[PDB]
């Protein structure tokens, strides 16, 4: 017997899936990955449920202040989101001290403004002065005035329902299931439409126009990208095998990063949040790097922004199934695309972000640039760019692609850009 409990509200949208309120319990009957067959205890109905909407009874995940599988940087982003205030906190798996837990607390500071400070927890305790049998008790105490903390505990971090998992056994779907409602953009290779999958589900469809490339071999290449899932890559949901091929991805509410930075709201975005974007793209490129693959076309036009202002990477694994200002020299000439050729493109993308979407090398045509890259000309630093940030672009713009950084390093440098190493966690006597 395995009892689980709902963490959020879910209304059914399919045939054999269940509806449940927050707090409903149910018996796990089958573990089919993203979807589980369960029998509700409230309605006694047997059906399918999203496994990422429930957890085992009286687990820590059930608790409103606990956050599973979240990094220190995500915990920082989640707390500095709108809807939280002074004292807003969370308890999470310690990213560094594995098998243990850390506490992230929102705090204000005149020097910078809102910040997130992190304390490690070691029965548990932070300072030997105060011992605690369990976390909830430990929480309660620190809600009663800051016992050494930078602030007194107020409310757990605001969380929203995760994205509903895709329909089961629906990697290949008929076109009839779709209603392409609005053309978002078109190009030399096809159109990107925003659509709807059998009502209830809002998707975006990339219509791949008929060609030589992968007529019967697209599904093959495309089936690999499906296994390269990441929180910072655009999620591939479904595919239409009948030519013209349709690619169903998740809908990114605020379009491309390029169009977004050129937007009004985008122009309002300050500098530390632009670097936050960069650190997200770098996080995604660090994954493609770990899988020893390649994106082949990094630019703001290929970065999408969610409604929550989360940057994700598209298309990826598309240039291998079919423009040079973002391209490194050793690919313009020798046609050699490495993971380091993307590093160059990231440096360009970085500048593209700091300049709010300004075209690289402005008032400077393509041929008038290639002959400068041989001289050693690089784009200059603008007034609004940190010296230590232009420093990174230049490292991405090294002539030797071997002495260019890794995305693993680039991400780490961008994640704690305003944080000194020693200041990551707080000391307490
Ligand atoms: N998903 C979206 N949601 C909201 N807006 C989107 C998009 C997309 C968009 C971008 C890229 C893709 N395609 C892919 O990511 C992809 C395609 C084939 C193989 C592997 C990956 C599909 C849609 C593009 N836009 C905008 C940007 C420019 C035109 C409309
Ligand atoms: Ca310290
Ligand atoms: Cl039962």
Q: Are residues 334 and 223 in the same domain?
A: no
**Contact 247 CB / ligand 1 (< 6 Å):** yes
- How many angstroms does the Cα of residue 54 sit away from the middle of ligand 1? 30
Q: Are residues 241 and 372 in the same domain?
A: no
Q: Counting atoms of ligand 1 from 1, which one is nearest the CA of 250?
A: 1
| CA separation for the pair 91, 61 (Å, rounded) | 10
Residue nearest to atom 21 of ligand 1 (CA): 315
Structure tokens at 95: 């990213």
249: nearest Cα among 209, 212, 205, 308: 205
Contact in structure between 289 and 410 (CB atoms under 8 Å): no
Is 423 contained in some domain?
Answer: no
Experimental method of this PDB entry = X-ray
* CA angle, residues 318, 319, 324, in degrees to nearest 5: 140
Torsion of CA 376, 381, 385, 388, to 10 degrees: 50
Dihedrals φ, ψ of 61, to 5°?
-60, -30
Binding residues for ATP: 184-192, 206
Dump strand ranges (E) for 314-411: none
Is 426 contained in some domain?
Answer: no
CA distances (Å), origin 317, targets 176, 205, 225, 288: 26, 16, 7, 10
Is 429 contained in some domain?
Answer: no
Q: Would you call 374 exposed, middle or buried from its count of C-beta atoms within 10 A (0-12, 13-18, 19+)? A: exposed
β-bridge partners, 208: 190, 245
Q: Are residues 358 and 332 in the same domain?
A: yes
DSSP assignments along 259-272, one per residue? HHHTSHHHHH--HH
- How many angstroms does the Cα of residue 414 sit away from the middle of ligand 1? 26
- How many angstroms does the Cα of residue 270 sit away from the middle of ligand 3? 54
From 103, 129, 159, give the residue that closes a domain.
159
| CA separation for the pair 364, 288 (Å, rounded) | 32
Q: Would you call 229 exposed, middle or buried from its count of C-beta atoms within 10 A (0-12, 13-18, 19+)? A: exposed
From 159, 184, 217, give the residue that closes a domain.
159
CATH code where residue 95 lies: 3.30.505.10
Our mutation pick for probing the ligand 1 site, out of 171, 207, 234, 311, counting the most ligand atoms within 8 A of Cβ, is: 234
Is 92 contained in some domain?
Answer: yes
| CA separation for the pair 89, 141 (Å, rounded) | 14
**Contact 185 CB / ligand 1 (< 6 Å):** yes
> Largest alpha-carbon pair distance within the chain?
74
Torsion of CA 363, 367, 369, 373, to 10 degrees: 180
Is 422 contained in some domain?
Answer: no
| CA separation for the pair 40, 105 (Å, rounded) | 36
Signed CA dihedral, 370, 374, 375, 378: sign only: positive
Q: Are residues 9 and 42 in the same domain?
A: yes
Is 333 contained in some domain?
Answer: yes
Resolution in A for the shown PDB structure? 2.9
**Contact 318 CB / ligand 1 (< 6 Å):** yes
Active-site residue, 264 included: no
- How many angstroms does the Cα of residue 310 sit away from the middle of ligand 2? 29
DSSP assignments along 32-48, one per residue? ETTEEEEEESSS--EEE
Q: Counting atoms of ligand 1 from 1, which one is nearest the CA of 321?
A: 19
Q: Counting atoms of ligand 1 from 1, which one is nearest the CA of 234?
A: 15
**Contact 252 CB / ligand 1 (< 6 Å):** yes
Q: Are residues 104 and 42 in the same domain?
A: no
- How many angstroms does the Cα of residue 310 sit away from the middle of ligand 1? 15
β-bridge partners, 312: 304
H helix and E strand count, the chain: 11, 18
Contacts of 314 (CB under 8 A, 6+ apart): 233, 234, 249, 302, 303, 304
- How many angstroms does the Cα of residue 176 sit away from the middle of ligand 1? 20
Q: Are residues 26 and 124 in the same domain?
A: no
Contact in structure between 349 and 300 (CB atoms under 8 Å): yes
Q: Residues 297, 315, 342, 415: which is the catalytic one?
A: 297
Domain count, the chain: 4
Residue nearest to atom 14 of ligand 1 (CA): 315
Closest ligand to the CA of 117: 2
185: nearest Cα among 119, 259, 121, 241: 259
Our mutation pick for probing the ligand 1 site, out of 186, 192, 211, 310, counting the most ligand atoms within 8 A of Cβ, is: 192
Closest ligand to the CA of 38: 3
CATH code where residue 263 lies: 1.10.510.10
From 111, 140, 159, give the residue that closes a domain.
159
In which residue are the tokens 């940030």 written? 389
Is 164 contained in some domain?
Answer: no
**Contact 306 CB / ligand 1 (< 6 Å):** no
Contacts of 111 (CB under 8 A, 6+ apart): none
Structure tokens at 358: 């300004």
Residue 182, H or E segment: strand 182-186
Is the bond into 92 cis (omega within 30 degrees of 0)? Answer: no
| CA separation for the pair 235, 252 (Å, rounded) | 10
Residue nearest to atom 17 of ligand 1 (CA): 315
Q: Are residues 189 and 219 in the same domain?
A: yes
Q: Are residues 111 and 193 in the same domain?
A: no
CATH code where residue 35 lies: 2.30.30.40
**β-strands 3-6, 245-250 pairing:** unpaired
CATH code where residue 226 lies: 3.30.200.20
Residue nearest to atom 25 of ligand 1 (CA): 255
Is 394 contained in some domain?
Answer: yes
Q: Are residues 268 and 139 in the same domain?
A: no
**Contact 192 CB / ligand 1 (< 6 Å):** yes
Q: Which domain holds residue 18?
A: 1-62
| CA separation for the pair 135, 142 (Å, rounded) | 11
Residue nearest to atom 16 of ligand 1 (CA): 315
Q: Are residues 245 and 273 in the same domain?
A: no
**Contact 206 CB / ligand 1 (< 6 Å):** yes
- How many angstroms does the Cα of residue 164 sit away from the middle of ligand 3? 25
Q: Counting atoms of ligand 1 from 1, which one is nearest the CA of 314?
A: 15
Binding residues: 184-192, 206
In which residue are the tokens 């059998």 written? 198
CA distances (Å), origin 294, targets 7, 227, 228, 310, 333: 37, 15, 12, 21, 18
Is the bond into 188 cis (omega within 30 degrees of 0)? Answer: no
Chain centre distance of CA 241: 28
Q: Are residues 390 and 309 in the same domain?
A: yes
**β-strands 190-197, 303-305 pairing:** unpaired
Structure tokens at 320: 């291998």
Q: Are residues 79 and 153 in the same domain?
A: yes
Residue 367, H or E segment: helix 367-373
């Amino acid at each position: 017997r395995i009892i689980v409990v709902a963490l959020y509200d879910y209304e059914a949208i399919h045939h054999e899936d269940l509806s449940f309120q927050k707090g409903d319990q149910m018996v796990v009957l089958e573990e089919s990955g993203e979807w589980w067959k369960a029998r509700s205890l409230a309605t006694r109905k047997e059906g399918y449920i999203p496994s990422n909407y429930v957890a085992r009874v009286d687990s820590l995940e059930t608790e409103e202040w606990f956050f599973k599988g979240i990094s220190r940087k995500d915990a920082e982003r989640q707390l500095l989101a709108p809807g939280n205030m002074l004292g807003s906190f969370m308890i999470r798996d310690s990213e560094t001290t594995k098998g243990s837990y850390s506490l992230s607390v929102r705090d204000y500071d005149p020097r910078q403004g809102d910040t997130v400070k992190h304390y490690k927890i070691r029965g548990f305790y932070i300072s030997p002065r105060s011992t605690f049998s369990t976390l909830q008790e430990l929480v309660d105490h620190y809600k009663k005035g800051n016992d050494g903390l930078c602030q007194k505990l107020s409310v757990p971090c605001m969380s929203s329902k995760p994205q509903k998992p895709w329909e089961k056994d629906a990697w290949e779907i008929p076109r009839e299931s779709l209603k392409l409602e609005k053309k978002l953009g078109a190009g030399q290779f096809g159109e990107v439409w925003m659509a709807t999958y059998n009502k209830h589900t809002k998707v975006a469809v990339k219509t791949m126009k008929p060609g030589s490339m992968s007529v019967e071999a697209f599904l093959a290449e495309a089936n690999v990208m499906k296994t390269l899932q990441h929180d910072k890559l655009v999620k591939l949901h479904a595919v239409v095998t009948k030519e013209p091929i349709y690619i169903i991805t998740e809908f990114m509410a605020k379009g491309s990063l390029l169009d977004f930075l050129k937007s009004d709201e985008g122009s309002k975005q300050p500098l530390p949040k632009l670097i936050d974007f960069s650190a997200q793209i770098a996080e995604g490129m660090a994954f493609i790097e770990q899988r020893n693959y390649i994106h082949r076309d990094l630019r703001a036009a290929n970065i999408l922004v969610s409604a929550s202002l989360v940057c994700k990477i598209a298309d990826f694994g598309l240039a291998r199934v079919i423009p040079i200002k973002w391209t490194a020299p050793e690919a313009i000439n020798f046609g050699s695309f490495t993971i380091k050729s993307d590093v160059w493109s990231f440096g360009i993308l970085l500048m593209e972000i700091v300049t709010y979407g300004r075209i690289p090398y402005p008032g400077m045509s393509n041929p008038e640039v290639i002959r400068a890259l041989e001289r050693g000309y690089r784009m200059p630093r603008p007034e609004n760019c940190p010296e230590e940030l232009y420093n990174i672009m230049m490292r991405c713009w090294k002539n030797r692609p071997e002495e260019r950084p890794t995305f693993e390093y680039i991400q780490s440098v961008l994640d704690d850009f305003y944080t000194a190493t020693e200041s990551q966690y707080e000391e307490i006597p």
